[PDB]
């Protein structure tokens, strides 16, 4: 392989961590779990895998035992025709710690995992001890609001969230060619590119290289519209709630967040983009302790 | 494989075409001329060349001295670094013109190349004796209200206007794969897709499929912030200025015609999405012998 496997970058790391798979309702699921102490889900997004959460793993395993998983469509997971939108991806979670013998987690999720987390807390409250979103709030109306272009100096255009809605083009242009994609991403976000080096990046790249991985990852985006409806049916969530807003996106996210539950709190990652598990590990990592307990 | 050269290609059709070139203001630019009578400039858009009026130019070389350009960074034209606002590419087909002893030319545009049109009649009305608008109205504010989601029941994503603007990006995604780009759009407008043959599909995709060449093509729409502030500045056009729309189009390009000139007559291209020199060749010729007379 072009780069190390899930088992090698596992076990790699710091806290004995361990690279698993779990067949629930026939989906594959990937995952790599470590550490002693309440359950702790981290859901990671796109166009990353779990290994986006390798700073902060660590530290989280010595207060908790460390879940972090590939969704269906990512990484090591299968990646089936369809049920992409949020509230199954969260099904899919729900029976995964269920099956691990979990009655209930603590869940934290980023980019497309943290929609996932929000409908998981969400859908299966009763298995939900708390919930932290990371960056980026659940779909509702307001996607229909997301503008082509940007007038000069106001702010960076949502490209792909249009790109990723087409059939076949993308893997077309995408497959093998992720890294480039990769680099864009970093390119507008990283304070300092070092944050990301150059193997971590070709490791995203070769989980989302193959047609089919650039198809999955699509298609992620394509349920926005069915996302939304869902959306309109949640109920408040009563359980604890934590937002952490990078730069760009925390107004938006707290806002959200305080409409959508009764009992938010708010972290601001004040050096961060998007990327929070990467541009500011410790003060992710830190405010997930903090809130979890 | 290869495809015919634009001398192979321009002798290849009834009514005596010559392959040209013209240097002016240090950028050369390729020409396709033939026919008698007043001058009629005609001006391709984007990912495509002179040749998408191939199913036109024999008819209307029996009433006129055809001038099919490509545009600067376009096909066999040169793709200087900068110079691709509207304005400044009017100015280069202004130069041409004159250049070739014609103190008013009839001008007809289509997509980017409309854009073009209608900046040449904005800044040099003296040298437009009518102008043709094909589908595509020149940038204005209203670009920027353009959306990125459409709900399940409408249109086509406006992908491209997103895509387009990016640095690096997309000349690293596209280069040598620029087939699959134009299979994706004629798949999402014509009606039969023999309406647009392999080898004209190839043609174009040898034109752009180089690195510098997607680059170029992208200046184009990278211009926009630029093309909206000229906009501003534009008096009404009052020499006759015809617009064909195609279905879907034809509203939005007949308000703001109407709204921008004070002489204004409307064609519908009812079977077209939006190539209308290709999907509808014989309503564009007709439509544009009436109007020039
Ligand atoms: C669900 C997702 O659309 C995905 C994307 O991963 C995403 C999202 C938000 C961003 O603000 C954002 C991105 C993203 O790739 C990106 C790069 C650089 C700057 C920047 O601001 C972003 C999202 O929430
Ligand atoms: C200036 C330009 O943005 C360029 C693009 O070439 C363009 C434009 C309009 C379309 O409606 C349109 C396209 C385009 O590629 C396309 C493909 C399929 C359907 C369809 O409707 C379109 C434009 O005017
Ligand atoms: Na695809």
């Given at each position: 392989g072009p780069v190390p496997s899930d088992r090698e970058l596992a076990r790699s790391l710091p806290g004995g961590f361990r690279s698993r798979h779990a067949r629930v309702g026939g989906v594959r699921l990937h995952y790599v779990s470590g550490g002693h102490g309440e359950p702790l889900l981290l859901v990671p997004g796109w166009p990353q895998?779990?290994?986006?959460y390798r700073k902060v793993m660590p530290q989280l395993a010595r207060r908790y035992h460390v879940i972090a998983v590939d969704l269906?469509?990512?990484?090591?997971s299968d990646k089936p025709?369809?049920?992409?939108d949020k509230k199954t991806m969260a099904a899919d979670l729900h029976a995964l710690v269920r099956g691990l013998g979990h009655r209930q987690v603590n869940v934290a999720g980023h980019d497309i995992g943290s929609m996932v987390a929000f409908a998981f807390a969400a859908n299966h409250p009763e298995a939900t001890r708390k919930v932290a979103l990371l960056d980026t709030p659940h779909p509702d109306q307001?996607?229909?609001?997301?503008?082509i272009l940007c007038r000069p100096g106001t702010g960076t255009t949502l490209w792909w969230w249009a790109f990723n809605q087409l059939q076949a083009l993308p893997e077309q242009l995408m497959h093998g060619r992720m890294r480039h994609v990769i680099d864009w991403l970093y390119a507008n976000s990283?304070?300092?590119?070092?944050?990301?080096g150059d193997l971590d990046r070709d490791i995203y790249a070769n989980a989302y290289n193959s047609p089919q991985a650039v198809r999955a990852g699509t298609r992620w985006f394509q349920a926005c519209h069915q996302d939304i409806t869902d959306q309109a049916g949640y109920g408040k969530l009563t359980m604890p709630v934590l937002g952490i807003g990078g730069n760009f996106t925390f107004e938006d996210l707290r806002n959200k967040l305080t409409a959508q539950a009764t009992d938010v709190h708010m972290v601001r990652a004040?050096?961060?983009?998007?990327?929070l598990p990467e541009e500011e590990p410790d003060v992710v990592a830190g405010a997930l302790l903090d809130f979890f307990g």
């Open positions: 895998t779990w290994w986006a269906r469509g990512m990484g090591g025709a369809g049920g992409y307001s996607e229909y609001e997301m503008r990283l304070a300092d590119q070092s944050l990301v004040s050096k961060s983009v998007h990327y």
